[PDB]
Coordinates of C-alpha atoms in Angstrom, one line a residue:
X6 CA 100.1 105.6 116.2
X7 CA 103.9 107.4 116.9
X8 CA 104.7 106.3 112.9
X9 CA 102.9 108.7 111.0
X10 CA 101.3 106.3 108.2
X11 CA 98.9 105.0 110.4
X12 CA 95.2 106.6 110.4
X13 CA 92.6 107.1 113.1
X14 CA 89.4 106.1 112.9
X15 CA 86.1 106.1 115.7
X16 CA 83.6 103.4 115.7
X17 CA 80.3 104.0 114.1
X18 CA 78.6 100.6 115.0
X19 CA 79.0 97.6 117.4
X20 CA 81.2 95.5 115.1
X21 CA 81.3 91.6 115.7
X22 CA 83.9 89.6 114.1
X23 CA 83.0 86.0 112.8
X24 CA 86.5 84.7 112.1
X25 CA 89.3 84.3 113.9
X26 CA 90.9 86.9 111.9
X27 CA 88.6 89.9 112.3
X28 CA 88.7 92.2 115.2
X29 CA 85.6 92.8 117.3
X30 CA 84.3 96.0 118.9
X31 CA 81.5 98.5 120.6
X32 CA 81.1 101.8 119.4
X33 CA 82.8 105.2 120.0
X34 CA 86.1 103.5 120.0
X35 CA 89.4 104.7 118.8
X36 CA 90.7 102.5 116.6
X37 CA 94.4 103.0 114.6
X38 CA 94.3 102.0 110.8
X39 CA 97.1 100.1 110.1
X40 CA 96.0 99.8 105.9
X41 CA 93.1 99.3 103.7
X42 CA 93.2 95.4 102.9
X43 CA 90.5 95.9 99.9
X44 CA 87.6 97.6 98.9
X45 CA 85.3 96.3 102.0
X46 CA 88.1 96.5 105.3
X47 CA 90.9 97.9 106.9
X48 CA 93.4 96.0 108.8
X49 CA 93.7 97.3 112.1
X50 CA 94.3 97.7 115.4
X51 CA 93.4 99.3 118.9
X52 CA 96.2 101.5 121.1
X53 CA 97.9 99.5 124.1
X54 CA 95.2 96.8 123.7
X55 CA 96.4 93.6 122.4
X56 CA 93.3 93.5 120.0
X57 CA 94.2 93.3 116.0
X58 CA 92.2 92.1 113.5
X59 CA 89.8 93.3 110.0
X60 CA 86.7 95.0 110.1
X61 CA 84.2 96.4 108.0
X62 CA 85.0 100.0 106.4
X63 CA 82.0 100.8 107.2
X64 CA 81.5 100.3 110.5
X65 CA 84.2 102.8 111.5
X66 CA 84.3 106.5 110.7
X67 CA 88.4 107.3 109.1
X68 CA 90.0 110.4 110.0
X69 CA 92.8 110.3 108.7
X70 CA 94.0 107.5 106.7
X71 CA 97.1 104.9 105.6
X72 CA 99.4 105.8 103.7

């Protein structure tokens, strides 16, 4: 999160991905926003983990967001 288009969000839920694709999670986790895909999820990522994926919007509480 050094590039300042990136937003942070904390983990509301327990999110498990189903697909390859989406990135899986417990709660009170950090998570860095990399951009909203769509109306239903972010594409994201977690710092220093190699961990990327989608998840739900709203699993995940957004402080600040992509721009």
């Amino acid at each position: 999160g050094i590039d300042p288009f990136t937003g942070e969000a904390i983990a509301k839920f327990n999110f498990n991905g189903d697909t390859q694709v989406e990135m899986s999670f417990r709660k009170g986790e950090r998570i860095t926003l990399l951009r909203q895909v769509d109306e239903n999820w972010y594409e994201g990522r977690i710092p220093g983990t190699s961990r990327q994926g989608i998840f739900p919007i709203t699993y995940v509480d957004v402080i600040k967001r992509p721009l």
